[PDB]
Structure formats: structure tokens, C-alpha cells
Amino acid sequence: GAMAPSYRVKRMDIAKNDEECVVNAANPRGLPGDGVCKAVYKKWPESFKNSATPVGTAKTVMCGTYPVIHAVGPNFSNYTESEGDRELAAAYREVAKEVTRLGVNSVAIPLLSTGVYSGGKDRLTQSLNHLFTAMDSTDADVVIYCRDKEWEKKISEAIQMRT
Ligand SMILES: NC(=O)c1ccccc1O
Ligand SMILES: NC(=O)c1ccccc1O
Ligand SMILES: [Cl-]
Ligand SMILES: [Cl-]
Ligand SMILES: [Cl-]
């Protein structure tokens, strides 16, 4: 575990992270995808061997010895708000199990279901709160990656508020 487990946020490409493993915002079929998923495919293409996994789950594939945790958030275009909320919470609980199993001291994580899978809604708070619910009981250093300057400030505020 980390000596003093923390949350941090950085506004940069998750493919350039400084952590011991990465969470991919994957699609269920293990396809190259868009946004985070396409950056992860360019950086760690070997980790897409048999990465397909259902919505609400996470499947880890090694790229060399570097673990890529493929986490499948729901597409809110297809799910009801209620069922989508349930699957989004479940994906993050499976990420926490994988981070724990791997015995890593740090993890790079995007906000699941906030891009193409958001169904055109702002889900920063919804996705971040499910991330905290899952990861608060883990002792890894968590580093959240985002692109938007206003999202960086809002994620930083939410982290700082809890202390
Ligand atoms: N400003 C950027 O280029 C950037 C920042 C965060 C994530 C992906 C990116 O391409
Ligand atoms: N490559 C990225 O990390 C990125 C790309 C799109 C949106 C958010 C992100 O953090
Ligand atoms: Cl960058
Ligand atoms: Cl997304
Ligand atoms: Cl963002």
C-alpha cells in the first residue's frame, strides 16, 4: 500500500501516467474505441488480447508487466438513468477488486461514462462519487486523469473538500 493513501487529479493524457497501473474506459467488445480508450490502445495495444468483458465489469490484461484494467461503464444512450447508475457503480467496485488483487501502490483512473457514453449529460459528480465509494477502502494512491480545465478545478475541489 501507499504510506499515506491520497487522491490527486491531473489534466493530461492518461497514456503518459506515472502510476503502477492504468484503468481503461473500455467498450464491452475490446475495440480500440474513442477518447481514453483510443489513447490506451495506441500506448498498450498488447493489453487488448481477450479484453472483451460485459458492462459493469473490469478485466485486467498485462502489457509486458504493466497492468491495464479494462473497466466497462454503461452507455447512458442505451441504459435508463437508474440501471446506468447501478452498472456505473458496479464497474468501479470491480476496479477496486482488481487494484487490490494486483497489489499496486498507485493507479491512474479516468471518470467512467463521462465522454461518448454520458448520453449527452454532465456526469462529473455522479461518476466521481462512485469512484470514491469503490476506492476509499483501498490503500493505493489514486490519480484521476481528465482533459477539461473546468473539470480539473471541480475534481480538485471535490478531493480537497473531504480534506
Ligand atoms: N491538453 C491535452 O492535449 C490533453 C490533456 C489531457 C488529456 C488529453 C490531452 O490531449
Ligand atoms: N487521453 C486522456 O487521458 C483523455 C482523453 C479524453 C478525455 C479525457 C482524458 O483524460
Ligand atoms: Cl498531455
Ligand atoms: Cl465514456
Ligand atoms: Cl475531461
Side-chain angles (χ1 to χ4, degrees):
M3 275 308 108
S6 64
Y7 288 107
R8 291 169 62 228
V9 60
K10 300 205 288 176
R11 194 188 77 90
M12 58 178 282
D13 192 349
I14 198 167
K16 306 181 196 195
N17 75 75
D18 194 32
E19 289 68 61
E20 291 183 356
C21 71
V22 71
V23 175
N24 183 27
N27 59 74
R29 304 180 180 272
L31 294 159
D34 291 299
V36 160
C37 188
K38 172 48 59 157
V40 169
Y41 185 76
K42 284 194 174 142
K43 184 56 69 174
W44 305 283
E46 298 92 340
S47 69
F48 290 69
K49 183 167 189 58
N50 295 308
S51 63
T53 196
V55 170
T57 73
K59 184 170 196 184
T60 301
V61 184
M62 288 297 174
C63 176
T65 69
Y66 188 80
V68 177
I69 305 169
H70 297 276
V72 183
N75 180 1
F76 278 95
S77 291
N78 295 334
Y79 284 89
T80 67
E81 285 291 338
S82 182
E83 197 74 355
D85 186 70
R86 196 186 59 67
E87 290 294 4
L88 179 55
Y92 281 116
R93 294 188 298 274
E94 298 303 304
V95 167
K97 295 177 190 175
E98 283 297 283
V99 165
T100 299
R101 186 183 63 73
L102 289 162
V104 294
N105 294 330
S106 61
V107 56
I109 193 164
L111 297 185
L112 301 180
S113 292
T114 62
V116 296
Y117 277 14
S118 70
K121 297 202 175 166
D122 179 342
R123 300 189 182 271
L124 189 172
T125 297
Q126 176 181 24
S127 184
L128 183 58
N129 282 340
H130 284 325
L131 188 162
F132 286 152
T133 296
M135 298 306 295
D136 277 349
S137 68
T138 73
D139 60 3
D141 283 336
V142 172
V143 182
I144 300 162
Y145 286 74
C146 70
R147 188 159 63 185
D148 184 276
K149 292 166 174 230
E150 291 309 302
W151 280 41
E152 179 188 12
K153 294 188 207 159
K154 282 182 275 185
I155 300 160
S156 180
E157 288 161 16
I159 291 165
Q160 290 311 129
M161 283 296 281
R162 338 159 78 205
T163 293

PDB file of all heavy atoms in Angstrom, residues 2 13 16 21 27 29-30 32-33 35 47 49 53 56 65 89 91 94 107 110 114 135 147:
ATOM      1  N   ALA A   2       0.230   2.411  -0.299  1.00  0.00           N
ATOM      2  CA  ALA A   2       0.884   3.732  -0.176  1.00  0.00           C
ATOM      3  C   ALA A   2       1.008   4.113   1.299  1.00  0.00           C
ATOM      4  O   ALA A   2       0.139   3.687   2.089  1.00  0.00           O
ATOM      5  CB  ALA A   2       0.122   4.733  -0.986  1.00  0.00           C
ATOM      6  N   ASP A  13      -2.878  13.496 -20.648  1.00  0.00           N
ATOM      7  CA  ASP A  13      -3.116  12.184 -21.269  1.00  0.00           C
ATOM      8  C   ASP A  13      -2.789  11.068 -20.272  1.00  0.00           C
ATOM      9  O   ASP A  13      -1.615  10.982 -19.784  1.00  0.00           O
ATOM     10  CB  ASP A  13      -2.264  12.063 -22.521  1.00  0.00           C
ATOM     11  CG  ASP A  13      -2.607  10.891 -23.412  1.00  0.00           C
ATOM     12  OD1 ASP A  13      -3.392  10.009 -22.968  1.00  0.00           O
ATOM     13  OD2 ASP A  13      -2.107  10.894 -24.563  1.00  0.00           O
ATOM     14  N   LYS A  16       0.244   8.835 -20.534  1.00  0.00           N
ATOM     15  CA  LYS A  16       1.550   9.337 -20.038  1.00  0.00           C
ATOM     16  C   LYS A  16       1.585   9.271 -18.496  1.00  0.00           C
ATOM     17  O   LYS A  16       2.412   9.978 -17.873  1.00  0.00           O
ATOM     18  CB  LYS A  16       1.816  10.765 -20.533  1.00  0.00           C
ATOM     19  CG  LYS A  16       1.729  10.975 -22.046  1.00  0.00           C
ATOM     20  CD  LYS A  16       2.050  12.441 -22.329  1.00  0.00           C
ATOM     21  CE  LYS A  16       1.691  13.027 -23.678  1.00  0.00           C
ATOM     22  NZ  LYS A  16       2.378  14.333 -23.920  1.00  0.00           N
ATOM     23  N   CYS A  21      -0.228   1.117 -12.569  1.00  0.00           N
ATOM     24  CA  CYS A  21      -1.242   0.522 -13.474  1.00  0.00           C
ATOM     25  C   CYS A  21      -2.232   1.586 -13.953  1.00  0.00           C
ATOM     26  O   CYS A  21      -2.281   2.688 -13.407  1.00  0.00           O
ATOM     27  CB  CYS A  21      -1.955  -0.650 -12.818  1.00  0.00           C
ATOM     28  SG  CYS A  21      -3.078  -0.177 -11.479  1.00  0.00           S
ATOM     29  N   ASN A  27     -14.714  -0.335 -23.992  1.00  0.00           N
ATOM     30  CA  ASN A  27     -16.018  -0.804 -24.513  1.00  0.00           C
ATOM     31  C   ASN A  27     -16.117  -2.307 -24.283  1.00  0.00           C
ATOM     32  O   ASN A  27     -15.104  -3.002 -24.062  1.00  0.00           O
ATOM     33  CB  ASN A  27     -16.224  -0.407 -25.973  1.00  0.00           C
ATOM     34  CG  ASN A  27     -15.146  -0.957 -26.842  1.00  0.00           C
ATOM     35  OD1 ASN A  27     -15.121  -2.166 -27.122  1.00  0.00           O
ATOM     36  ND2 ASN A  27     -14.242  -0.070 -27.232  1.00  0.00           N
ATOM     37  N   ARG A  29     -16.472  -4.847 -26.117  1.00  0.00           N
ATOM     38  CA  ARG A  29     -16.008  -5.761 -27.189  1.00  0.00           C
ATOM     39  C   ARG A  29     -14.507  -5.718 -27.321  1.00  0.00           C
ATOM     40  O   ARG A  29     -13.989  -6.448 -28.147  1.00  0.00           O
ATOM     41  CB  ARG A  29     -16.693  -5.421 -28.516  1.00  0.00           C
ATOM     42  CG  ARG A  29     -18.206  -5.476 -28.354  1.00  0.00           C
ATOM     43  CD  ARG A  29     -18.996  -5.161 -29.604  1.00  0.00           C
ATOM     44  NE  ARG A  29     -20.390  -5.258 -29.234  1.00  0.00           N
ATOM     45  CZ  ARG A  29     -21.124  -6.369 -29.275  1.00  0.00           C
ATOM     46  NH1 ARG A  29     -20.609  -7.517 -29.679  1.00  0.00           N
ATOM     47  NH2 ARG A  29     -22.359  -6.349 -28.831  1.00  0.00           N
ATOM     48  N   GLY A  30     -13.806  -4.953 -26.483  1.00  0.00           N
ATOM     49  CA  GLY A  30     -12.340  -4.860 -26.604  1.00  0.00           C
ATOM     50  C   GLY A  30     -11.905  -4.178 -27.868  1.00  0.00           C
ATOM     51  O   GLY A  30     -10.831  -4.534 -28.357  1.00  0.00           O
ATOM     52  N   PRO A  32     -10.747  -0.724 -30.225  1.00  0.00           N
ATOM     53  CA  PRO A  32      -9.968   0.486 -29.958  1.00  0.00           C
ATOM     54  C   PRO A  32     -10.744   1.716 -29.474  1.00  0.00           C
ATOM     55  O   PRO A  32     -10.181   2.499 -28.714  1.00  0.00           O
ATOM     56  CB  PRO A  32      -9.227   0.753 -31.283  1.00  0.00           C
ATOM     57  CG  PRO A  32      -9.212  -0.585 -31.973  1.00  0.00           C
ATOM     58  CD  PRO A  32     -10.526  -1.241 -31.587  1.00  0.00           C
ATOM     59  N   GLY A  33     -12.003   1.890 -29.857  1.00  0.00           N
ATOM     60  CA  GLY A  33     -12.848   2.956 -29.272  1.00  0.00           C
ATOM     61  C   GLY A  33     -12.406   4.391 -29.545  1.00  0.00           C
ATOM     62  O   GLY A  33     -11.695   4.634 -30.557  1.00  0.00           O
ATOM     63  N   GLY A  35     -11.486   8.546 -27.432  1.00  0.00           N
ATOM     64  CA  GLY A  35     -11.050   9.261 -26.213  1.00  0.00           C
ATOM     65  C   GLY A  35      -9.994   8.503 -25.436  1.00  0.00           C
ATOM     66  O   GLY A  35      -8.947   8.152 -26.022  1.00  0.00           O
ATOM     67  N   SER A  47      -2.510  -5.128 -24.589  1.00  0.00           N
ATOM     68  CA  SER A  47      -3.447  -5.344 -23.465  1.00  0.00           C
ATOM     69  C   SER A  47      -4.857  -5.559 -24.003  1.00  0.00           C
ATOM     70  O   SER A  47      -5.746  -5.882 -23.195  1.00  0.00           O
ATOM     71  CB  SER A  47      -3.481  -4.190 -22.463  1.00  0.00           C
ATOM     72  OG  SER A  47      -4.054  -3.038 -23.018  1.00  0.00           O
ATOM     73  N   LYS A  49      -5.685  -8.058 -26.076  1.00  0.00           N
ATOM     74  CA  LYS A  49      -5.848  -9.526 -26.279  1.00  0.00           C
ATOM     75  C   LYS A  49      -6.900 -10.066 -25.304  1.00  0.00           C
ATOM     76  O   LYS A  49      -6.624 -10.095 -24.089  1.00  0.00           O
ATOM     77  CB  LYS A  49      -4.514 -10.255 -26.095  1.00  0.00           C
ATOM     78  CG  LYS A  49      -4.578 -11.760 -26.345  1.00  0.00           C
ATOM     79  CD  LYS A  49      -3.215 -12.419 -26.462  1.00  0.00           C
ATOM     80  CE  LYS A  49      -3.284 -13.861 -26.929  1.00  0.00           C
ATOM     81  NZ  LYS A  49      -3.967 -13.995 -28.240  1.00  0.00           N
ATOM     82  N   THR A  53     -15.347  -7.758 -22.179  1.00  0.00           N
ATOM     83  CA  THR A  53     -15.947  -8.052 -20.861  1.00  0.00           C
ATOM     84  C   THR A  53     -17.262  -7.289 -20.776  1.00  0.00           C
ATOM     85  O   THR A  53     -17.419  -6.269 -21.413  1.00  0.00           O
ATOM     86  CB  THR A  53     -14.949  -7.731 -19.734  1.00  0.00           C
ATOM     87  OG1 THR A  53     -15.419  -8.360 -18.540  1.00  0.00           O
ATOM     88  CG2 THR A  53     -14.733  -6.247 -19.559  1.00  0.00           C
ATOM     89  N   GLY A  56     -20.357  -3.099 -16.581  1.00  0.00           N
ATOM     90  CA  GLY A  56     -20.375  -3.225 -15.114  1.00  0.00           C
ATOM     91  C   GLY A  56     -19.211  -4.058 -14.569  1.00  0.00           C
ATOM     92  O   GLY A  56     -19.223  -4.377 -13.365  1.00  0.00           O
ATOM     93  N   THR A  65       4.768  -6.312 -18.102  1.00  0.00           N
ATOM     94  CA  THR A  65       4.365  -6.458 -16.695  1.00  0.00           C
ATOM     95  C   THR A  65       3.481  -5.296 -16.250  1.00  0.00           C
ATOM     96  O   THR A  65       3.199  -5.257 -15.063  1.00  0.00           O
ATOM     97  CB  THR A  65       5.538  -6.518 -15.703  1.00  0.00           C
ATOM     98  OG1 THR A  65       6.196  -5.243 -15.612  1.00  0.00           O
ATOM     99  CG2 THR A  65       6.518  -7.577 -16.140  1.00  0.00           C
ATOM    100  N   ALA A  89     -21.706   2.258 -10.879  1.00  0.00           N
ATOM    101  CA  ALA A  89     -21.229   1.917  -9.516  1.00  0.00           C
ATOM    102  C   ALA A  89     -20.542   0.557  -9.557  1.00  0.00           C
ATOM    103  O   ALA A  89     -19.490   0.410  -8.902  1.00  0.00           O
ATOM    104  CB  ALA A  89     -22.361   1.911  -8.519  1.00  0.00           C
ATOM    105  N   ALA A  91     -19.027  -1.107 -12.096  1.00  0.00           N
ATOM    106  CA  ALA A  91     -17.729  -1.074 -12.815  1.00  0.00           C
ATOM    107  C   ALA A  91     -16.637  -0.617 -11.824  1.00  0.00           C
ATOM    108  O   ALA A  91     -15.553  -1.206 -11.771  1.00  0.00           O
ATOM    109  CB  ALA A  91     -17.791  -0.172 -14.031  1.00  0.00           C
ATOM    110  N   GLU A  94     -15.579  -3.235  -9.314  1.00  0.00           N
ATOM    111  CA  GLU A  94     -14.696  -4.272  -9.912  1.00  0.00           C
ATOM    112  C   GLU A  94     -13.295  -3.698 -10.094  1.00  0.00           C
ATOM    113  O   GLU A  94     -12.351  -4.475  -9.928  1.00  0.00           O
ATOM    114  CB  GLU A  94     -15.317  -4.826 -11.208  1.00  0.00           C
ATOM    115  CG  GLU A  94     -16.645  -5.502 -10.936  1.00  0.00           C
ATOM    116  CD  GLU A  94     -16.597  -6.633  -9.931  1.00  0.00           C
ATOM    117  OE1 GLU A  94     -15.808  -7.564 -10.168  1.00  0.00           O
ATOM    118  OE2 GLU A  94     -17.356  -6.589  -8.899  1.00  0.00           O
ATOM    119  N   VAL A 107      -2.523   3.872  -8.986  1.00  0.00           N
ATOM    120  CA  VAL A 107      -3.425   3.573 -10.148  1.00  0.00           C
ATOM    121  C   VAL A 107      -3.829   4.900 -10.789  1.00  0.00           C
ATOM    122  O   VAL A 107      -4.240   5.835 -10.055  1.00  0.00           O
ATOM    123  CB  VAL A 107      -4.649   2.715  -9.745  1.00  0.00           C
ATOM    124  CG1 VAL A 107      -5.465   3.343  -8.637  1.00  0.00           C
ATOM    125  CG2 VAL A 107      -5.533   2.420 -10.946  1.00  0.00           C
ATOM    126  N   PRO A 110      -9.575   7.170 -15.206  1.00  0.00           N
ATOM    127  CA  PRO A 110     -10.417   8.189 -15.833  1.00  0.00           C
ATOM    128  C   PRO A 110     -11.810   8.202 -15.180  1.00  0.00           C
ATOM    129  O   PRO A 110     -12.193   7.224 -14.483  1.00  0.00           O
ATOM    130  CB  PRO A 110     -10.447   7.671 -17.270  1.00  0.00           C
ATOM    131  CG  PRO A 110     -10.535   6.167 -17.115  1.00  0.00           C
ATOM    132  CD  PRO A 110      -9.702   5.855 -15.862  1.00  0.00           C
ATOM    133  N   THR A 114     -18.306   9.437 -18.742  1.00  0.00           N
ATOM    134  CA  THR A 114     -18.394  10.931 -18.763  1.00  0.00           C
ATOM    135  C   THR A 114     -18.142  11.493 -20.166  1.00  0.00           C
ATOM    136  O   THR A 114     -18.373  12.702 -20.333  1.00  0.00           O
ATOM    137  CB  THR A 114     -17.461  11.611 -17.745  1.00  0.00           C
ATOM    138  OG1 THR A 114     -16.098  11.309 -18.052  1.00  0.00           O
ATOM    139  CG2 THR A 114     -17.826  11.226 -16.333  1.00  0.00           C
ATOM    140  N   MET A 135     -13.149   3.195  -4.193  1.00  0.00           N
ATOM    141  CA  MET A 135     -11.700   3.237  -3.997  1.00  0.00           C
ATOM    142  C   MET A 135     -11.358   3.675  -2.561  1.00  0.00           C
ATOM    143  O   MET A 135     -10.199   3.535  -2.199  1.00  0.00           O
ATOM    144  CB  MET A 135     -11.052   4.182  -5.007  1.00  0.00           C
ATOM    145  CG  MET A 135     -11.240   3.786  -6.463  1.00  0.00           C
ATOM    146  SD  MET A 135     -10.719   2.087  -6.867  1.00  0.00           S
ATOM    147  CE  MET A 135      -8.952   2.155  -6.588  1.00  0.00           C
ATOM    148  N   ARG A 147      -9.216  15.946 -19.158  1.00  0.00           N
ATOM    149  CA  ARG A 147      -8.769  16.810 -20.285  1.00  0.00           C
ATOM    150  C   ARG A 147      -9.244  18.255 -20.085  1.00  0.00           C
ATOM    151  O   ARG A 147      -8.496  19.183 -20.473  1.00  0.00           O
ATOM    152  CB  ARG A 147      -9.313  16.289 -21.618  1.00  0.00           C
ATOM    153  CG  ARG A 147      -8.747  17.019 -22.829  1.00  0.00           C
ATOM    154  CD  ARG A 147      -8.865  16.217 -24.103  1.00  0.00           C
ATOM    155  NE  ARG A 147     -10.263  15.976 -24.426  1.00  0.00           N
ATOM    156  CZ  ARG A 147     -10.687  15.217 -25.433  1.00  0.00           C
ATOM    157  NH1 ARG A 147      -9.817  14.621 -26.232  1.00  0.00           N
ATOM    158  NH2 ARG A 147     -11.984  15.059 -25.633  1.00  0.00           N
TER     159      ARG A 147
END
